[PDB]
Write a protein that binds this ligand. Structure first.
Ligand SMILES: CNC(=O)CC[C@H](C[C@H](N)C(=O)O)C(=O)O
Ligand SMILES: [Cl-]
Ligand SMILES: [K+]
Ligand SMILES: [K+]
Length: 254
């Protein structure tokens, strides 16, 4: 009956500061695919919300003692009711929080400058001249850390010995690919957005795995089921496809 606390972080084109001459405040500060999604869920389900940026700016991972951070920790501590963001649904996380059914499907792939004609992950793993890494404390990093696939094991070994291989966020990571001989391990629908706008960057290879984004909730949340059905209904009508086209719609690359 109360407004729901929504945790998030800034990530183009999912959650961004809207442009204005005015100083903005409250929910009005934000726009993007997840905000559009949040509005539709709120309309369909009849709830209100207050959006808050997660203080540590992280999605969430476990430390050596097994303690979480990021939005995942916000849910665990019940400081937020929902995590509305491009939050990857993973089995390791389902151990701490719950998820709606996925609202978007994606996979891990490679972002790299057009040039050295690498064609796959295997090529990166067998060398060190081209450094590579991932966003710290995100799903992609954790995927590598936990993998039993020989190649990805080789990659994690490399990433974790190399001090700045793992970057604070996408913005930092993308910049590194543009200024250093560096490849970023990143999620594919994001790679898609970036390579349409940065014509010297490209995706290398295809998708190495396949997973989903979902809305996070505290374990046992009373909103989770209701969110899932609304999401399912949005997909049936191709609305999430249309919504994506809206925010990915950009000026192409020769
Ligand atoms: C769409 N957001 C990003 O690419 C930022 C980092 C992401 C965050 C990831 N979806 C996660 O849930 O931890 C990643 O680790 O690949
Ligand atoms: Cl905030
Ligand atoms: K402003
Ligand atoms: K209300």
């Amino acid at each position: 009956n109360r407004s729901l606390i929504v945790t998030t972080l800034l990530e183009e084109p999912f959650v961004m500061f809207r442009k204005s001459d005015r100083t903005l405040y409250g929910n009005d500060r934000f726009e993007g695919y997840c905000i559009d999604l949040l509005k539709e869920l709120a309309h369909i389900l009849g709830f209100s919300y207050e959006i808050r940026l997660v203080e540590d700016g992280k999605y969430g991972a476990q430390d050596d003692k097994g303690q979480w951070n990021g939005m995942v920790k916000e849910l665990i501590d019940h400081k937020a009711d929902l995590a509305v963001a491009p939050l990857t649904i993973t089995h390791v996380r389902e151990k701490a929080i719950d998820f709606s059914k996925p609202f978007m499907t994606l996979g891990v792939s490679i972002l790299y400058r057009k040039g050295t004609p690498i064609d796959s992950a295997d090529d990166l793993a067998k060398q060190t001249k081209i450094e590579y890494g991932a966003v710290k404390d995100g799903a992609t990093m954790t995927f590598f850390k936990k993998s039993k696939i020989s190649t990805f094991e080789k990659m994690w070994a490399f990433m974790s010995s190399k001090p700045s291989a793992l970057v604070k966020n996408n913005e930092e990571g993308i910049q590194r690919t543009l200024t250093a001989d560096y490849a970023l391990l990143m999620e594919s629908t994001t790679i898609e957005y970036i390579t349409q706008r940065n014509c010297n960057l490209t995706q290398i290879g295809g998708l190495i795995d396949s997973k989903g984004y979902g809305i996070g909730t505290p374990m046992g949340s009373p909103y989770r089921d209701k969110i899932t059905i609304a999401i399912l209904q949005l997909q049936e009508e191709d609305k999430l496809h249309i919504m994506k086209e809206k925010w990915w719609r950009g000026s192409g690359c020769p």
